[PDB]
Design a protein around this nucleic acid. Structure first.
Lengths: 142, 344, 86
RNA sequence: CCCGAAAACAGGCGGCCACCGAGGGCCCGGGAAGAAGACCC
RNA sequence: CUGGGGAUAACAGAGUCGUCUCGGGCGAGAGCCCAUAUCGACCCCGAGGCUUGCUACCUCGCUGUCGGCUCUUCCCAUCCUG
RNA sequence: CGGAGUAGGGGGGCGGUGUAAGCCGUCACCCGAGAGGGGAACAACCCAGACCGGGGUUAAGGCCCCAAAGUGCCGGCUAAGUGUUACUCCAAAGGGUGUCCCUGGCCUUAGACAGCGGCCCGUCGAGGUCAGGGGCCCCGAAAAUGGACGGGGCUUAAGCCGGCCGCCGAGACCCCGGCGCACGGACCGAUUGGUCCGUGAUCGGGUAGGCGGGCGUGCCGAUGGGGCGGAAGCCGGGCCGUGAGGUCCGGUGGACCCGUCGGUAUUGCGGAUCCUGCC
RNA sequence: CUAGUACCGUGAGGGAAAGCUGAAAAGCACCCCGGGAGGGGGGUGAAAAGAGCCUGAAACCAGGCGGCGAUAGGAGGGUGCGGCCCGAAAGGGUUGACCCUCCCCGAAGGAAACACGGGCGACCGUGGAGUACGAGGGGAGGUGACCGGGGUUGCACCGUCCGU
């Protein structure tokens, strides 16, 4: 499987590349999800994500949108948004993905791939926030 | 427009039948004293006493009526030790160690016991667990306990539970557990007179009830009483949203719920059915016996107030996860009268 | 083994042609010269070992993909699978 | 505080059996449980 | 009474906002003197769709009703509580 | 000469009226009576008018993923997720040492602040200060189930301005092969015609409606036939036919049936809150 | 056809449904089960055609056979393929199904590597080259048995019922 280290990567670009990989047919693992970044203003970003988490069906909450509070689930959900999710093809492609906070002992001892199109260095404006900080604001465990 | 609060709470939903009659403890208190953080017994009945008030507030120093519940507590047996480690999300069990000689009745809960499992094997397993804990991987140690309902002739099938240990050192906890395993444990070694406690049990069952009693809904006007709708709610909601909302009160199961109470005071701990007030030794059992429960004969807790459950139900106790700031002293109060007249 | 990946059917976002297919060769040299495969046969194997045969027709884009005709066409069970060039 | 292994990474631990038979149900005497089912002794 | 009509009213809905509810700009002044603590003419610019009108796109046997009782939920342009 | 249908129109542009929406006319491009390719979905906004099977090139538009094709190039702007909207279907008067530009005056080697010292000098001693106009953004800016740039998301962009280079993409256009139609012609029929040739960039959508040719059902006059070695009907299958349909195979069945020419008719059903029977 | 009958209404009056064993009753002797309707064996007849009787359609019901079937979204279909099952005759085919290899022609259309130059650049020009290829049209050599068709289902994309 292709193991990718997310330290210092732009989220949507990472997700686009990963989605195309999955559709072409590869198995992908992503480590260090809490260290990817989101560009823009702290308050706007936090407001957007809080609004997302406070969406719910008014007649039954056991149904309803379940938007994440954890960093790995946030990354996973971005990728899922980038796929055709209402088809067997996309369901399989999404099943072929795994995301992890940190580097678990299992993967300890390997060399990690990167992505050039996605890296903090193509940027010039310092306004940026971390997915771990988003998760802390929302109140999720790591 | 008229305003008023909604009928009932949404904090105890869904209001369904409890998963088990044996209640589960979800959270534990932070205690510095290295001890077992709870006990279990069986509810017996209620009486009242006259005591001199201790707690802060008005009425302090005066003689007051106090209702009392009695809980029979025979000694527990410690049959195991568990180790916990930290996984990706939460805690996960690392391993278990059991005692080799268990009562014949334990097989009524645990149908599949080991065949030979001698003492030397038990000791080797203890040693393995000790060395595992002695490294730094382990994060928590808990005791495995079973009741002994046969001493008091109530039944023969025991209740099996897990209890946490106080402190903040796994090695201290393990030393305690290793000095406890394989033996009987009493309530006086665990609890201290005057404490505040939280009680846990499953409430009395009442079957299916309607919304008037399940939620506090009002009875309609007498015209509706003669129309056929007295004990009904008006409507299930508006045109849009074109569905029934989960917040609308409806009929269903009432009673037999898992519930927790806060800050009930432990008054006294008795032995062999007796209490010592002024040198005397008096019996708590009233003349004729407790209704629907016979004579108390082993050991008992005296708890202030009321507690969930029917009479012969299993009760669990833990110390005060959420106490107030002006606690009363941890000491048995001055009691002037205990009622032991007939209760039926 | 001189193989390629099947990517997609030909067409637009709203319609597709089910007898034509877009292929991505895996070797970097064939990708650098994908036009030197125009006219070559290309085979796909079924779960029962049967063979479906097609032909590379022309180039598609600039990144190194090619277009192929397969009459009789391929099934949807072959869209992220391997194909062998001859 | 209440619900919660159908949490599709559909979990962890200990133990028993298989690779005749572990275990479970009907049945019998009964409630602290109960519309039928279920629950408990 | 019969036959029809949403080719055409009452009626809720759609559209519009003259009117309605809520605001703003500039500054004559009033405020012992001091436009702006407070009030703020004349004249200009708006939001909402909760009042009434205008229109006649939808329904002529969908339900043709007002008010009250009962039950749930949302908005803020906040009466009290911070 | 003969046979009709049409006497409620609508979208879009222009005019009178009206607070406006709408009302009344006007033009005659579209929908009605118009498939296909796009605008998220849209009767009339864009491309574009359709016999059948195939092969290619373009149009509208698009090229980070959903989704075929560029994480494309050069110069510049925006920091507000502003924006990511051709139209259908997007809030202003009034303000802003927020930033990027253009212009025109006035002081300058001791100027325009602060400062040692009451218009003055010793020092901080190098450029500054007023007016207009432009681009982008900001304030002005409040609504009711949970939520809408189509979504994910995007910050030297996947946004905006001025330009540029390649690629993808229709039934449109080019090409090969087949069907028909209109017109003309040659030859040929025991009745409304038939075989073949030539032309068709300038023939191939279609409601109301008009016209031509065919399929099928029951009876009569003639002609040619089949049938207990198994007619009609029924069930399941194969072949021909654009098709309405026809014919053959096997099984069931047990007494009548068909082709051609010419005539006749209670002659073809999915609907009528249709009628009868059955379920 | 036991019809102006049965049946409806105080009455004046209103008014149905219902055809066919077989040439011949040869209309089922005798046995076992069952309280009995009857069932199962045996018989008549060219054929059960069995009096609930010519033929015996559809809707509907049950069983058997085949395919699918408990993580999943559209008016129940359309295009293209894949998997399981049926495939005597009426369709093709040992006078050769299907598959494999090479050779010739070829409409519209139509590349690339590489070499030399222009452009800040994305790219372009010249030559290669009207070559490789190309819908179709023909021919030569090899293996030897199915193909077409039908039922059901899987994937991809499209598709908001009929009449007024």
């Amino acid at each position: 499987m292709r193991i990718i280290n997310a330290e210092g990567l732009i989220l949507g670009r990472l997700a686009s590349k990963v989605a195309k990989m999955l559709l072409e047919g590869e198995e992908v693992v992503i480590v260090n999800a809490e260290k990817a970044i989101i560009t823009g203003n702290r308050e706007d970003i936090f407001a957007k994500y809080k609004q997302r988490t406070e969406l719910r069906t008014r007649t039954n909450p056991r149904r309803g949108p379940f938007y994440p509070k954890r960093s790995d689930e946030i990354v996973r959900r971005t990728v899922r948004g980038m796929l055709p999710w209402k088809t067997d093809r996309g369901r399989k492609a999404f099943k072929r993905l795994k995301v992890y906070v940190g580097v678990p002992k299992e993967f300890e001892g390997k060399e990690f791939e990167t992505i050039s199109e996605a890296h903090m260095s193509r940027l010039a404006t310092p306004k940026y926030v971390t997915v771990g900080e988003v998760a802390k604001f929302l109140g999720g465990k790591f | 427009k008229i305003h008023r609060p909604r009928r009932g709470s949404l904090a105890y939903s869904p209001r369904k039948r409890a998963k088990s009659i044996v209640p589960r403890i979800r959270s534990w208190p932070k205690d510095s004293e290295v001890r077992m953080l709870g006990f279990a017994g069986y509810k017996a009945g209620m009486t009242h006493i006259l005591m001199i008030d201790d707690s802060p507030g008005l009425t302090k120093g005066k003689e007051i009526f106090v209702p009392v519940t009695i809980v029979e507590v025979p000694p527990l047996f410690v049959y195991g030790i568990r180790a916990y480690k930290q996984g990706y999300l939460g805690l996960e069990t690392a391993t278990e160690v059991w005692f080799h000689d268990l009562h014949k009745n334990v097989a009524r809960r645990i149908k599949t016991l080991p065949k030979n499992y001698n003492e030397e094997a038990f000791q080797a397993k203890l040693g393995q667990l000790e060395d595992l804990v002695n490294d730094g991987e382990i994060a928590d140690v808990r005791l495995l306990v079973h009741t002994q309902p046969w001493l008091i002739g109530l039944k023969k099938k025991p209740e099996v539970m897990e209890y946490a240990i106080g402190g903040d050192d796994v090695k201290a906890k393990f030393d305690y557990a290793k000095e406890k395993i394989g033996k009987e444990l009493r309530a006086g070694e665990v609890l201290h007179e005057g404490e505040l406690l939280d009680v846990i049990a499953v409430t009395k069952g009442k079957g299916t009830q309607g919304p008037v009693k399940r939620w506090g809904v009002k009875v309609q006007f007498h015209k509706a009483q003669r129309a056929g709708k007295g004990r009904h709610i008006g409507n299930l909601g508006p045109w849009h949203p074109a569905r029934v909302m989960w917040t609308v009160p409806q009929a269903g199961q009432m009673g037999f719920h898992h519930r927790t109470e806060f800050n009930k005071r432990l008054i006294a701990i008795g032995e062999n059915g007796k209490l010592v007030l002024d040198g005397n030794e008096i019996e708590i059992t009233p003349k004729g016996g407790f209704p629907h429960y016979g004579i108390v004969r082993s050991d008992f807790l005296m708890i202030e107030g009321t507690i969930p459950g029917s009479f012969k139900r299993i009760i669990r106790v833990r110390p005060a996860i959420r106490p107030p700031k002006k606690k009363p002293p941890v000491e048995r109060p001055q009691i002037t009268y205990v009622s032991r007249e007939s209760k039926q | 083994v001189r193989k390629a990946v099947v990517l997609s059917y030909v067409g637009s976002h709203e319609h597709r042609d089910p007898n034509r297919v877009i292929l991505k060769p895996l070797d970097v040299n064939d990708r650098g010269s994908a036009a030197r495969l125009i006219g070559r046969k290309v085979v796909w194997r079924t779960p029962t070992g049967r063979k479906l045969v097609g032909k590379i027709v022309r180039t598609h884009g600039t990144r190194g993909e090619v277009k192929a005709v397969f009459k009789p066409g391929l099934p949807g069970q072959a869209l992220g699978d391997y194909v062998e060039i001859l």
